[PDB]
Write a protein that binds this ligand. Structure first.
Ligand SMILES: CCOC(=O)c1ccc(OCCCC2CCN(c3ccc(C)nn3)CC2)cc1
Ligand SMILES: *C(=O)CCCCCCCCCCCCC
Ligand SMILES: *C(=O)CCCCCCCCCCCCC
Lengths: 4, 59, 279, 266, 62, 62, 266, 4
């Protein structure tokens, strides 16, 4: 994932 | 490619004019654009590159 | 956070600094805030400009075309067994005006197709459910002459096969312009007339027009063979510019559009009557 | 320090220098100074021609007269400069050309004269035409050269269907293109208000959807000058003062050399 | 490849930071939905295009 | 078994590297979609099939 | 290594390329390549115009025919190039101009053809005239442009005192200037001997008593082509083959810009 | 996962  | 006899000699001008002016009717006008003066001899063939000269990125 | 600047508490002033006076001749808009000319309190400002971002302003599906196509017996006179549409945002006024607040643009496009149909005549039996083919024909490709000629084989052209009653069809298209941005306005010509020309038709172009076909056409047909009874169908195309970027702002269109160019013809009087000293 | 001012400027390009003692600061369109095509934005692969001082200098166009009846004037670039010295030659000998511009509009009068000129620099200034016929304005008419074009207080439709004039009919309050003049201020501009200033100075970047293009086929910028407030003096109901437009090409470069373009302007 | 971001919560239930999840199913970026998280900028290039930008408490013409 | 790759982003929103996720649901590789990430090659086998390939600034015939 | 030769050359300047399979090496006049005016040799203080690729490229002049009766041909530089594209424009828009040149003379025939052309590059090629009248050759006559001039086997004095022709009368064995042709070899030169070579290539520096000068008033170099040995073929007593001259300006720079010089050539 |  890429939690921004 | 020159497919003449070996004893035959000659010099030819091949050219490219980027768009926008009158299409060349004389060597005189043609000379002013991109051109190669081809000399006939042992190397039978001559290449002229038409360089990408354009306003738009893709034609 | 994207909230706007908080209002600052500002008190009385007796000074040589005069924010209220300026000179518009310079070309600049005077950057004043209420605290520059009146006494203000402190306001912790929570409002935001989220809904006026370029993406938000254009993030909506707009009707750009109604393509009418018929399914009926192939007679021998001009019919609508298939139809073609030049892709443009200009056959409609609403989206055209929004995009035209800007000179140049860049975006991907979402096309959504709503397809409705109905019976023409009182009765000749009924119709089994129809499947529609929407073929994109890029400039250069063979255009259809007949509703079922070889062009519809679509071996390289993109086609959508829509089934009536299904959820409205949808596709996305990339930024396909020949330039680094779509020109909403082109002060120029595709050809220059030269002194050495034979007729003067040779160098004649439409003012402000760029390429002849520009983006190509959508060809629409009903793939179904005809029933005894005729069915008329309409394809409504909704386009949405997504992942948008725009350059050079322009004044909004103030009078009604007269075709693809900036031309005006009538109703050149947009402004109402109102007395100078009447609130 | 010393005594420097917003009002007093000197502009020097090539062998040309302009002085102004009454300016109202100067505008750089869109905050962008003119620059050359960078390798990472380049498109024609051929080594460009950069004529520098011979073309990037101040060419003064023919003066126009501002009177009580004047509705407005307009010019297109590069078209206005097509016959200006070596710039013109370079423009017509090459398929492609890009150039930025310093625009200096001049109009002096007296402490007792009155009036205000709106000076606008418009990207892609597409103008409206003559007729029922859409997009029909002819090349020769769309391009007045140095002479420029004029504005009108109202739309007179070119009626002679048999032999159409094929001209623009630019109505002043519609900025000649179907929008309202008051909103033209969103374009890079200055105002010459006679009580305040002699001139306007607008620096223009190359603006286009492409890094370079055909200067003969397409105009990038339009200069529109309109009387926001009419000329007036003492009681003399027929006052007339000159407006002089001077323009310099900046960071000019050309690609695609061949024989010269000779457009038919008749 | 899941993408996680915070929603800007307008009306709040009687129940803090709330999230939403995004996954791109297509290879072509054109096919993607809009992020709508967009950066704002200075009006300056439009509101103050001056060579010598002057400060508001000083005379515009000097 | 999720597969994650970078999209080549053409037009960019006013919002960097963007990804997409792929999962194969079927045992037979035939059932799979196309990766479209493909390697290119030399025209040489076609443009220069010579026993003694010569350099362009030299005479083709010597 | 590989297979490189004295006889096979490629010359590329701007968008122009010349190939030759039968050259006889090439000459650099006085051992000096063309170069720009250095600051420590500079004289006009104004920033120069350097048009580069638009002017420094191969302009081909009109072809001449070599026959059994041909006595010789001559050209002057810059004059021969005065109407050649952007070079000509730059030349006439500026009081001052300097330029070097690559000269390429072309004449092919066959293994069975015979003859030899002497190709000479002469600094300050002052020619002799028509008359009893000394130093009387008119400007229009001293300057043939692209067309060039011709040589004669003997001196015919222009007799009509009443309306003098005011032309040059260049006698071939006197190099048209009172000296003997055989000694012309002290000038930078090549020979096109048909059994040996198709062409001549001479690179010329700017040669003058000054770093820069008026190109319209003064020619720096003269190109003289003479049949050292007459054209001959098999038994055909009326053989004729073409000679084509192609010239490129090199390191061209210009000073003193103003309105264009329009010389009266009638 | 296999992130490529
Ligand atoms: C001045 C005219 O309008 C525009 O500037 C303008 C209008 C639309 C726009 O979209 C690009 C147009 C071409 C697209 C439109 C539709 N396309 C497709 C492709 C496949 C299918 C099945 N259906 N449609 C693919 C190509 C881009 C620019
Ligand atoms: C990154 O995305 C790895 C985690 C994936 C979680 C499950 C995703 C389920 C949806 C996959 C769609 C595949 C589309 C071909
Ligand atoms: C690798 O794929 C492990 C991670 C799986 C994430 C959830 C996938 C959901 C879809 C599963 C489809 C099963 C098909 C039989």
């Amino acid at each position: 994932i890429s939690e921004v | 490619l020159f497919c003449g006899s070996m004893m035959a000699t000659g010099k030819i001008l091949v050219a490219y004019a980027p768009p926008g002016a009158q299409p060349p009717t004389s060597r005189k006008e043609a000379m002013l654009g991109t051109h190669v003066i081809w000399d006939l001899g042992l190397q039978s063939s001559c290449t002229m590159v038409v360089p990408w000269i354009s306003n738009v990125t893709y034609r | 956070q994207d909230s706007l600047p908080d209002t600052k508490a500002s008190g009385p002033a007796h000074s040589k600094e005069v924010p209220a006076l300026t000179a518009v001749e310079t070309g600049a808009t005077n950057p004043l805030a209420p605290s520059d000319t009146v006494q203000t309190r402190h306001v912790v400002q929570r409002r935001s400009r989220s809904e006026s971002t370029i993406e938000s302003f254009f993030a909506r599906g707009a009707c750009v075309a109604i393509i009418e196509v018929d399914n009926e017996q192939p007679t021998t006179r001009a019919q609508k067994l298939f139809a073609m549409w030049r892709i443009t945002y200009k056959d409609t006024v609403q989206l055209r005006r929004k995009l035209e607040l800007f000179t140049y643009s860049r975006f991907d496009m979402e096309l959504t197709f709503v397809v409705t149909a109905n019976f023409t005549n009182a009765n000749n039996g009924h119709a089994l459910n129809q499947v529609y083919q929407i073929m994109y024909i890029p400039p250069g490709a063979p255009t259809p002459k007949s509703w079922d000629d070889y062009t519809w084989q679509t071996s390289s052209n993109p086609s959508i096969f829509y089934t009536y009653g299904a959820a409205p069809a949808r596709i996305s298209v990339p930024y396909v312009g020949l330039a680094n941005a779509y020109s909403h306005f082109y002060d120029g010509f595709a050809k220059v007339p030269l002194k050495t020309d034979a007729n003067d038709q040779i160098g004649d172009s439409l003012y402000s027009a760029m390429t002849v076909d520009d983006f190509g056409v959508l060809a629409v047909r009903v793939v179904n063979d005809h029933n005894p009874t005729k069915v008329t169908s309409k394809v409504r195309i909704y386009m949405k510019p997504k992942h948008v970027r725009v350059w050079c702002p322009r004044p909004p269109r103030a009078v009604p559009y007269y075709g693809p160019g900036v031309d005006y013809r009538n109703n050149l009087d947009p402004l109402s009557e109102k007395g100078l000293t009447t609130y | 320090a010393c005594g420097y001012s917003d009002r007093v400027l000197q502009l020097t390009l090539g062998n040309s220098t302009i002085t102004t003692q009454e300016a109202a600061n100067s505008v750089v369109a869109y905050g962008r100074w003119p620059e050359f095509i960078r390798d990472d934005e380049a498109n024609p692969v051929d080594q460009p021609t950069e004529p520098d001082v011979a073309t990037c200098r101040f060419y003064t166009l023919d003066t126009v007269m501002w009177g009580k009846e004047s509705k407005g004037w307009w010019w297109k670039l590069p078209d206005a400069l097509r016959d200006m010295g070596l710039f013109g030659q370079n423009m017509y000998y090459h398929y492609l050309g890009r150039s930025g511009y310093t625009v200096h509009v001049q109009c002096n009068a007296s402490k007792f004269h009155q009036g205000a000129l709106g000076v606008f620099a418009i990207p892609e200034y597409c103008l409206a035409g003559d007729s029922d016929k859409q997009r029909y304005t002819s090349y020769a008419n769309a391009n007045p050269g140095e002479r420029g074009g004029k504005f009108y207080s109202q739309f007179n439709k070119d009626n002679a269907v048999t032999s159409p004039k094929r001209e623009f009919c630019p109505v002043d309050y519609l900025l000649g293109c179907g929008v309202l003049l008051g909103n033209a201020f969103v374009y890079p501009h200055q105002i010459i208000n006679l009580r305040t200033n002699n001139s306007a100075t607008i620096v223009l970047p190359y603006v286009n959807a492409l890094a370079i293009d055909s200067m003969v086929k397409h105009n990038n910028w339009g200069i529109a000058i309109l009387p926001l407030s009419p000329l007036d003096f003492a009681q003399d109901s027929s006052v007339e003062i000159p407006i002089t437009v001077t323009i310099a090409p900046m960071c000019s470069e050309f690609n695609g050399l061949r024989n010269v373009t000779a457009p038919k302007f008749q | 490849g899941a993408q996680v971001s915070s929603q800007k919560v307008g009306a709040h239930e009687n129940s803090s930071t709330i999230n939403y999840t995004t996954i791109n199913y297509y290879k072509d970026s054109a096919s993607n939905a809009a992020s709508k998280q967009d950066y704002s900028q200075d009006p300056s290039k439009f509101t103050e295009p001056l060579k010598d930008v002057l400060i508001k408490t000083a005379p515009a013409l000097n």
